[PDB]
């Protein structure tokens, strides 16, 4: 009834952020003057250090003082980021709103478990669906308004900075009057095959999170973007709405997974390596922007197929018991090979050099998967 719409309003709210489209064209541009190596090199690579601090820290924060305060946290964390990006100028100011969306990212596990925490024990996948679909909803039209705002009426990044900051303000404000859950989740006391698909859906989404975490400032050199040539906002929604719709498709084809879900991860994760050795070698932005739709669509496939293949066998509470520590291992997996390739004190790495990386990285795993699957020979040979 009550807590379900308000919590549904919280997400719309907070993940409605014009400014996100367009983050790094308006790093990259007069309001802030910053040079791409700096934001490449030194800004973002801290999100990824924060998100790891950050993690544990939030989860059992999350579970011990009932899952209400972390979405406040995530609320005034969204006030203060967008404040700071829209009154801050600096690289140890965008190091600061790095270690405040890693901070927001962490508390993100929150607007998830009060779900749980708070409806009925008749059903929880319902309600949850709803929820992440609505944020799904909130990001598309916040990346839509935002493309058609800089096309038609000439706004600036700053203004959609301002909007940003007031959808996280009205979001903050919905999430202050949450109802109060009356029981936690674990706070009391604490197959083997589940390994693979966890260092599936680890090794899969750590890529996925460094390959996002650049794929604008590979925009930005392909094309200038502090002009208007860029179509980011448009391919963003393009690339979400792709996203959602191939997720929805695992669901709505039902195959036998325990025969051929290897197959179609490496399949999928052969396409991902295509995809960004695609945006790598190309000269054209619409090449680029093309590679990122199929690149998103097929990480979500993987990380569905993935994803259903740890959950069919799990139990509810053990959902977050698993997931946590699987993006635990994401993280570290991300954080080692940022700072072997994106971090100054590592290689510093320009972005046009990156996506060969990311693109030889999941061609790696595919093929050391497959090559797991050496039993062919034994059997074949006699
Ligand atoms: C306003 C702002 C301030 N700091 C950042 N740092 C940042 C930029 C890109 C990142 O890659 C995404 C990695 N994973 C993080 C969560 C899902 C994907 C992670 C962190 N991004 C910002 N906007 C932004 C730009 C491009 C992509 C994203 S997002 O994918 O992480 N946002 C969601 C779709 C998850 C809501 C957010």
Redo the contacts with the bound molecule.
């Keep these: 009834i009550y807590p379900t719409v308000i919590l549904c309003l919280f997400g719309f709210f907070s993940?409605m952020?014009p400014?996100?489209?367009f983050?790094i064209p308006y790093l990259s541009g007069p309001d802030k003057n910053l040079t791409s190596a700096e934001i490449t090199n030194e800004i973002?690579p801290v999100?990824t250090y924060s998100y790891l601090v950050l993690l544990l820290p939030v989860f059992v924060l999350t579970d011990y003082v009932r899952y209400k305060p972390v979405i406040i946290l995530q609320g005034i964390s969204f006030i203060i980021?967008?404040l700071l990006?829209l009154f801050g100028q600096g690289v140890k100011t965008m190091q600061v709103?790095?270690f405040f969306?890693?901070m927001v990212?962490a508390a993100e596990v929150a607007y998830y478990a009060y779900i749980y925490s708070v409806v009925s024990p008749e059903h929880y996948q319902r309600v949850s669906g709803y929820c992440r679909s609505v944020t799904l909803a909130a990001?598309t039209a916040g990346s839509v308004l935002a493309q058609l705002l800089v096309s038609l009426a000439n706004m600036s990044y700053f203004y959609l900075n301002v909007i940003?900051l007031a959808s996280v303000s009205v979001a903050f404000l919905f999430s202050l009057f949450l109802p109060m859950p009356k029981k936690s989740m674990f706070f009391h006391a604490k197959s083997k095959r589940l390994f693979y698909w966890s260092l599936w859906w680890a090794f899969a989404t750590a890529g996925?999170?460094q390959v996002?975490?650049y794929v604008?400032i590979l925009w930005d050199y392909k094309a200038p973007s502090q002009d208007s040539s860029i179509y980011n906002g448009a391919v963003?929604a393009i690339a979400?709405f792709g996203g959602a719709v191939a997720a929805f498709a695992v669901g709505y084809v039902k195959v036998n997974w325990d025969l051929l879900g290897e197959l179609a991860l490496v399949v999928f994760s052969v396409v991902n390596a295509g995809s960004l050795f695609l945006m790598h070698y190309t000269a054209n932005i619409w090449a680029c922007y093309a590679g990122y739709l199929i690149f998103k669509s097929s990480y979500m496939l993987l990380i569905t197929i993935a994803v259903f293949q740890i959950a069919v066998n799990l139990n509810v509470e053990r959902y977050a018991l698993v997931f946590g520590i699987n993006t635990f291992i994401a993280l570290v997996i991300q954080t080692i090979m940022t700072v072997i390739v994106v971090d100054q004190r590592g290689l510093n790495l320009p972005v046009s050099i990156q996506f060969l990386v990311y693109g030889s990285y999941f061609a790696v795993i595919a093929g050391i998967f497959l090559m797991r699957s050496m039993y062919i020979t034994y059997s074949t040979k006699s």
């Design positions: 993940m952020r400014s996100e489209p983050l973002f999100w980021t967008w990006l709103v790095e969306y890693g990212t990001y940003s996925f999170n996002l975490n604008q963003e979400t």
